[PDB]
Amino acid sequence: VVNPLFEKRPKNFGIGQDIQPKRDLTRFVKWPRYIRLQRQRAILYKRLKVPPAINQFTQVLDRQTATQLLKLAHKYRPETKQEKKQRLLARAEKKAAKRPPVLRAGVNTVTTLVENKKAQLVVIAHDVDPIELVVFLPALCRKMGVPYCILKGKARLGRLVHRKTCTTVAFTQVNSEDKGALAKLVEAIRTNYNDRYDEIRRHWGGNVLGPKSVARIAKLEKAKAKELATKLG
Amino acid sequence: VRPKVLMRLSKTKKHVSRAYGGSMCAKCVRDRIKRAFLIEEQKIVVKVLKAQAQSQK
Amino acid sequence: KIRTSPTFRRPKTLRLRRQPKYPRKSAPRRNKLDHYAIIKFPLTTESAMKKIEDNNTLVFIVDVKANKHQIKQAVKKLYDIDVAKVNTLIRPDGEKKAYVRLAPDYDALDVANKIGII
Amino acid sequence: GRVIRGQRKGAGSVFRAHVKHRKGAARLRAVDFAERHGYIKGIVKDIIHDPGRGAPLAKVVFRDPYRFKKRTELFIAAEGIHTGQFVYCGKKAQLNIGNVLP
Amino acid sequence: GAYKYIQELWRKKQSDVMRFLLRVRCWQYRQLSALHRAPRPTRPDKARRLGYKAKQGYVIYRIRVRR
RNA sequence: CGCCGUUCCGAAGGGACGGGCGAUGGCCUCCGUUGCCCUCAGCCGAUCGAAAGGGAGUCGGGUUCAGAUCCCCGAAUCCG
RNA sequence: CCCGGUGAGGCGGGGGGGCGAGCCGGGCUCUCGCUUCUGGCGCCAAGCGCCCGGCCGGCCGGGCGCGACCCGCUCCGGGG
Ligand SMILES: [Mg+2]
Ligand SMILES: [Mg+2]
């Protein structure tokens, strides 16, 4: 029932033969300078030796912990501009006839709170740049005995406070209906960050060669171990 | 004629009623028809021998 | 999805047309090469008379910035005549002279009387 | 004293190469997949004289392995090549005059 | 009080932390052009004590001069 | 002040046959235009550089004090 | 940090397939990656599988996957 005129006309893509197919060349593209620069900065961080003070920021909350931490924090977001106008208007109505707990944003506000021991939990974004703004904070929070955690995204802390970005937030008080939720977080966070601090600050990062180099090293070793194995047979 | 004069000449004046006409001489078109056919035939022959030795292998 | 060329090229992006808040000029500039400006005066020399009588041609001194199209449109509108062709030379003193040949049904000697040339 | 002729040669000026009628730079093919793993075929179209050069140049045409194109290369003519000859380049070309091998 | 720690931190330019940051950043700065608009002050503490304020109308530029 | 440099450390194309979407028109029949999206694109060097190089196509007769392959009479031609 | 090449076009590792070897049909030392006769031609997919639409199982038109293996962190090389 098939039409006999139809037939296979396969292409032979060997060297010579037919022109090559338009296969994916994403790996061999000549990218703009700025793309090369930001990618090469990612390999340098892996390639070089990253001191523990900076490397600690690679250790971050697993997704399950961050989602719970961000769900609890979402109950304490600072009021927006639109709704702060409303509160003032109502205050006028209340006048014509207590401060709820709230998060604290910013490294300047949070640092002062941590020194005063007025913070119960400090959350630090893992990708602050320049890192100097926060590179000291983990060591400070441990000194004052404030539980702290490192979370993925200075922009996820941005969405909390209705701003593009935030370097760090802090719980100072919570409603009684939430004290249990904070208590569980603090206990889980503290064992990961404050208690391991002795090991966090002695743990360098990076210092990993590239896959081509590693494979070259392995293939050389795999020529000796096999040579060793056939030494006895 | 000069190259820009070719714009105002009909097509019959600028070519020949034959494949490649006006671009390749008849003598070399004869050689290409044979060369194309004869090399293509050689491919079939080698293909059968190559397939045969594969069968014999 | 995939790049089948090794070359990166700047992607094409939207380009909006200009929408000024105010016009940079309050009003458009007045046309300073109107019909009256183009035609200065007629030439009345001996060689000009010969053109009128023998070539059906009027001889005008025109603005040096005028072109043959504008001169033709000026001569027609000013004197309600028809033009066959306009020849122009720039004189050694810097003035532009127009040899305006009128249509065959227009008698240049008659038209010259209307213009007051003769 | 003044600047000697030898010094003046390095400034270009009247001491630059007479390249008005040179046919181009003579090079092998840019190395690509075909020459790294196999070979590629070309054809000697013409052997030409390059002004200012004793050696003749060969104009060898290849196919572009990725595009519908013909690539014209300007080789240094090996003695004995001829027009209409086939030359081959790559890791697996045969040992013949004019071929290009690692 | 964060601006105090950063000021003191940038006084330890031979520390391990600072050496890593200066080395990598000098490398990055060296891949760009000699005059380069910067998006924000690389040193928020130093910039502001020199008169900078984080408001519209203040811009930062990075310049590369041969030594 | 600027100099070097001319494809060399560059996200260097503002284009298009055709296809899909809308918005507008008119000899509102159906064709156009316009905006968006899909698709396709080496040229790879802005610009300048020759009244002797390259470069389509005008010739005959008459005519002035002085201009004519340019004006007039006639007969052609290229380009769009 | 420097050098060379390219329209930064198939690099590294593994998978999958082929000829040989040899231990008692399977594993492995270990190799290859389909072009060498001729001064031809060679792109803008055939084929197979899976879904979608339009008109009336038949006609007309789309999309996707394989064909064209997977994963990778420096384009590939040379220095350092
Ligand atoms: Mg003909
Ligand atoms: Mg000229």
UniProtKB/Swiss-Prot annotation, chain A:
Location relative to the cell: Cytoplasm
Location of cross-link Glycyl lysine isopeptide (Lys-Gly) (interchain with G-Cter in SUMO2): 22, 71, 212
Domain of life: Eukaryota
Keywords assigned by UniProt, alphabetized: Acetylation, Cytoplasm, Isopeptide bond, Ribonucleoprotein, Ribosomal protein, Ubl conjugation
Residue(s) carrying N6-acetyllysine: 8, 71, 184
One cellular component term from this protein's GO annotations in UniProt: cytoplasm
GO MF terms held by the record: RNA binding
Family assignment from sequence similarity: Belongs to the eukaryotic ribosomal protein eL8 family.
Subunit and partners: Component of the large ribosomal subunit. Interacts with CRY1. Interacts with DICER1, AGO2, TARBP2, MOV10 and EIF6; they form a large RNA-induced silencing complex (RISC).
Role noted for this protein: Component of the large ribosomal subunit. The ribosome is a large ribonucleoprotein complex responsible for the synthesis of proteins in the cell.
Stated name of the protein: Large ribosomal subunit protein eL8
From Swiss-Prot, chain C:
Region ranges (Beta-like import receptor binding (BIB) domain): 1-36
Phosphoserine sites (modified residues): 5
Molecular function via GO: rRNA binding; structural constituent of ribosome
Keywords carried by this UniProt record: Acetylation, Citrullination, Cytoplasm, Isopeptide bond, Methylation, Nucleus, Phosphoprotein, Ribonucleoprotein, Ribosomal protein, RNA-binding, rRNA-binding, Ubl conjugation
Compartment annotation: Cytoplasm; Nucleus
Post-translational modification: N-terminus is methylated by METTL11A/NTM1. Citrullinated by PADI4.
GO aspect biological process, one term: translation
GO terms for cellular component: cytosolic ribosome; nucleus; ribosomal subunit
List of residues that carry Phosphothreonine: 7
Citrulline: residues bearing it: 3
Biased composition annotated in UniProt, kind: Basic residues: 1-29
Residues with the N6-acetyllysine modification: 32
Job of this protein: Component of the large ribosomal subunit. The ribosome is a large ribonucleoprotein complex responsible for the synthesis of proteins in the cell. Binds a specific region on the 26S rRNA. May promote p53/TP53 degradation possibly through the stimulation of MDM2-mediated TP53 polyubiquitination.
Subunit structure: Component of the large ribosomal subunit. Interacts with LYAR and GNL2. Interacts with MDM2; this interaction may promote MDM2-mediated p53/TP53 polyubiquitination. Directly interacts (via BIB domain) with IPO5, IPO7, KPNB1 and TNPO1; these interactions are involved in RPL23A nuclear import for the assembly of ribosomal subunits. Interacts with IPO8.
Family: Belongs to the universal ribosomal protein uL23 family.
Domain text: The N-terminal beta-like import receptor binding (BIB) domain mediates interaction with IPO5, IPO7, KPNB1 and TNPO1.
Protein's UniProt name: Large ribosomal subunit protein uL23
Segment of the intact protein contained: 39 to 156 of 156
UniProtKB/Swiss-Prot annotation, chain D:
Position(s), cross-link Glycyl lysine isopeptide (Lys-Gly) (interchain with G-Cter in SUMO2): 41
Location in the cell: Cytoplasm
Post-translational modification: The modification is impaired by hypoxia.
Function recorded in the entry: Component of the large ribosomal subunit. The ribosome is a large ribonucleoprotein complex responsible for the synthesis of proteins in the cell.
Family, as annotated: Belongs to the universal ribosomal protein uL2 family.
Assembly: Component of the large ribosomal subunit. Interacts with CRY1.
Name listed for the protein in its UniProt record: Large ribosomal subunit protein uL2
Species whose genome carries this gene: Oryctolagus cuniculus (Rabbit)
Lineage: Eukaryota, Metazoa, Chordata, Craniata, Vertebrata
Residues of the full protein shown: 2 to 103 of 257
From Swiss-Prot, chain E:
Positions of post-translational Phosphoserine modification: 33
Source superkingdom: Eukaryota
Annotated source species: Oryctolagus cuniculus (Rabbit)
Protein name from the UniProt record: Large ribosomal subunit protein eL15
Transmembrane segments: none
Subcellular compartments: Cytoplasm
Residues bearing a lipid moiety (N-myristoyl glycine): 1
Functional note: Component of the large ribosomal subunit. The ribosome is a large ribonucleoprotein complex responsible for the synthesis of proteins in the cell.
Family: Belongs to the eukaryotic ribosomal protein eL15 family.
Section of the entire sequence shown: 2 to 68 of 204
Subunit: Component of the large ribosomal subunit. Interacts with IFIT1 (via TPR repeats 1-4).
This protein's encoding gene: RPL15
